[PDB]
Amino acid sequence: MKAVCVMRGEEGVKGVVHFTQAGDAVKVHAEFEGLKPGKHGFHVHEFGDTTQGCTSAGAHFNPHGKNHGAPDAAERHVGDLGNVTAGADGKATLDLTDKMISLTGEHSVIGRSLVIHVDPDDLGLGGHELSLITGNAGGRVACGIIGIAKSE
């Protein structure tokens, strides 16, 4: 099973993100250009709604109502995929394996949204009231809808 998400928002920011269901895990391959050098929070938000740009994407996909956290943490949202690190040339690549999200079933992220943020995801540890909620990653630089892709 395969998924793709093309991400857009602020001028110059471009992102493509491939997903591949591999048994009980999903492999994620994401690339970006046009980012500010440094770390950017990267999440699956709940809605595939772009009627209000990235704003209508809602909050972090959290079907279990748990606290925000790191991809590798005990407590986290299904949609918590950490930070994307933008290099000096404003470009980033991120590969990961996540057994939280799915391309099928109740954890499916099909038809939901990917959002990349202005600031870093403090991963629930920032000591800010937003930390266990959004990771305090600030505003939404680009977002996109997760659509079914050709499962070759």
**Shortest distance, position 49 Cβ to a copy of itself, whole Å:** 5
Is 29 assigned to a binding site? Answer: yes
Residue 114 pairs in a beta bridge with 44, 144
Nearest-angstrom CA–CA distance, 84 and 36: 11
Largest CA distance in the chain: 45
Q: Looking at 40, 76, 80, 112, which residue is catalytic?
A: 80
* CA separation for the pair 93, 17 (Å, rounded): 10
Q: Strand, coil or helix: what is 55?
A: helix
Report, in Å, the least distance between residue 63 CB and Zn ion. 6
In the region spanning residues 1 to 40, those forming contacts with Cu ion, defined by CB under 5 A, are none
Q: Is 80 in the site for Zn ion (CB under 5 A)?
A: yes
Q: Distance between CA atoms of 2 and 111, rounded to whole angstroms? A: 13
Clarify whether 43 is annotated catalytic: yes
Instruction: Report if residue 68 touches Zn ion, rule: CB under 5 A.
Output: yes
Query: Does 76 qualify as catalytic in the annotation?
Result: no
Structure tokens at 28: 């994620």
In this structure, how many other beta carbons lie within 10 angstroms of the beta carbon of residue 59?
Answer: 15
Residues between 31 and 90 with contacts to a copy of itself, criterion CB under 8 A: 46-51, 58
Residue 77 found at the interface with Cu ion (CB under 5 A): no
List binders of Zn ion among 10-39 (CB under 5 A): 31
d(CA 58, CA 126) in angstroms, rounded, equals 22
Residue 77 annotated to the active site: yes
Is there a binding annotation on residue 68?
yes
User: One of 40, 76, 112, 140 is an active-site residue; which one?
Assistant: 140
Could you list the residues that contact Zn ion (CB under 5 A)?
31, 60, 68, 77, 80
Task: Give catalytic residues, as residue numbers.
Answer: 43, 45, 60, 68, 77, 80, 117, 140
